[PDB]
Structure 1
Amino acid sequence: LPAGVDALVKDGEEVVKGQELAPGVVSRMDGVALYRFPRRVRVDYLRKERAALRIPLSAWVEKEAYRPGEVLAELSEPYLFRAEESGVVELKDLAEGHLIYLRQEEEVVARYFLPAGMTPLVVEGEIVEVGQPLAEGKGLLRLPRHMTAKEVEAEEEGDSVHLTLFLEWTEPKDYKVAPHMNVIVPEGAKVQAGEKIVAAIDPEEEVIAEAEGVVHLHEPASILVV
């Protein structure tokens, strides 16, 4: 296998006669294969949070588990997400969804969740007040394609309903491993916090777990099947 090309097959997966393990790779025998000298690993981390939010009841889709793209609310028109507190903001924007941290001085007063189509009305650090316009959803305003909403909350006041989620997203990052390095962890493993990933020539060139997540080996230098 040539430098940089990946394997369309997962490590330790049964492959068949003539079957494609890569764009040009042909396996002429039936059996199990294995990665040999991988040149990359994608480590997709998970991140929790506890964040509240609000939107009219004529919107709210009324679901507990919002799957990665489970349709969110209804929203007769472009409702303004209105601030319930004052503090410097934080635009954490993640794929289609945005996140906003409200902190005065140092400590955070609270964090707000902004699904797809819900746009930031202020650049990060720009001061906001209570009742101050924060976001705008319209129409669809659905959940992000990489995230998951756990543990729905219920608070009902007038037209605009309040709700909170524990929603936890994924923050993936990969690493390009080197000839002087070697992988210490199995394919598809679940890493701890600061887990040993790849031991290198110098102990410093090594890789640890950024926070916590899953390791996926890719770009193998070659693959052998028995």
Structure 2
Amino acid sequence: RVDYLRKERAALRIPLSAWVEKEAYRPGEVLAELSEPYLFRAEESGVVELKDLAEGHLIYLRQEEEVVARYFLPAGMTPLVVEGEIVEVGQPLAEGKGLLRLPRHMTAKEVEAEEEGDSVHLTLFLEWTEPKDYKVAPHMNVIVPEGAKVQAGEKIV
């Protein structure tokens, strides 16, 4: 069982009446109390990408090829759009309700603060674990040891 790492720098739009307000959120660490089911407001146009992560979601906004932005949907912040579907600016991207805590497999490092009125933007550098399994056969022999830290393009077995 190889648990890999995934790094992404993503933004978030949540009001200021919520914002649990921390520089580091552990898995399951509560984020953004809110009030009412805030509608995530797209700050860019493009086509989306819905990459489902455990409880949480991730929206990649790109025009043609290149990415225009990346958004993070905390647990309970629900997607209003289908992957690849064309969206616009200010469009109702997603909806959080109440709690909307941090995902259970993911961390948060190096928070950010952009605050305007009742709302605030937070750019979080997020890294998680996206594990995968490999079935070994008698035609194989494991090389790397148990609980080892593997590189990129590493001979495992």
TM over 0.5: yes
Alpha-carbon RMSD across the aligned residues, in angstroms, is: 0.5
Structure 2 SS opposite 1:175 = coil
Please state how far the C-alpha of 1:106 moved relative to its aligned partner.
Answer: 0.4
Q: Specify the structure having the higher radius of gyration (Cα).
A: 1
Residues in 2 aligned to 1:89 and 1:162: alpha-carbon distance in whole angstroms: 19
Residues in 2 aligned to 1:112 and 1:166: alpha-carbon distance in whole angstroms: 11
Please state how far the C-alpha of 1:47 moved relative to its aligned partner.
Answer: 0.5
Please state how far the C-alpha of 1:151 moved relative to its aligned partner.
Answer: 0.4
Residues 161-213 of structure 1, C-alpha deviations (whole Å, 9 max, x = no match)? 01101110111001000011000100000100010000xxxxxxxxxxxxxxx
Task: Give the TM-score normalised by structure 2.
Answer: 0.99
Aligned residue pairs, count: 157
Structure 1 SS opposite 2:8 = coil
Please state how far the C-alpha of 1:135 moved relative to its aligned partner.
Answer: 0.6
Residues 23-55 of structure 1, C-alpha deviations (whole Å, 9 max, x = no match)? xxxxxxxxxxxxxxxxxxx00000101111110
Give unpaired runs (5+ residues) of structure 1: 1-41, 199-226
> Residue 93 of structure 1: which of 43, 49, 52 is its match?
52
Residues 114-168 of structure 1, C-alpha deviations (whole Å, 9 max, x = no match)? 0000111010011110000001000110000000000000111111101101110
Please state how far the C-alpha of 1:94 moved relative to its aligned partner.
Answer: 0.6
Residues 69-111 of structure 1, C-alpha deviations (whole Å, 9 max, x = no match)? 0011111010000100011100001110000000000000010
Task: Give the TM-score normalised by structure 1.
Answer: 0.69
Give unpaired runs (5+ residues) of structure 2: none
Structure 2 counterparts to residues 25-174 of structure 1, below 5 A: 42-174=1-133
Please state how far the C-alpha of 1:62 moved relative to its aligned partner.
Answer: 0.2
- Identity within the alignment, %: 100
Residues in 2 aligned to 1:59 and 1:127: alpha-carbon distance in whole angstroms: 29
Please state how far the C-alpha of 1:64 moved relative to its aligned partner.
Answer: 1.1
Structure 1 SS opposite 2:137 = coil
Residues in 2 aligned to 1:73 and 1:158: alpha-carbon distance in whole angstroms: 16
Residues in 1 aligned to 2:152 and 2:100: alpha-carbon distance in whole angstroms: 34
Residues in 1 aligned to 2:38 and 2:112: alpha-carbon distance in whole angstroms: 20
Structure 2 SS opposite 1:69 = coil
Residues in 2 aligned to 1:64 and 1:170: alpha-carbon distance in whole angstroms: 20
Residues in 2 aligned to 1:64 and 1:167: alpha-carbon distance in whole angstroms: 12
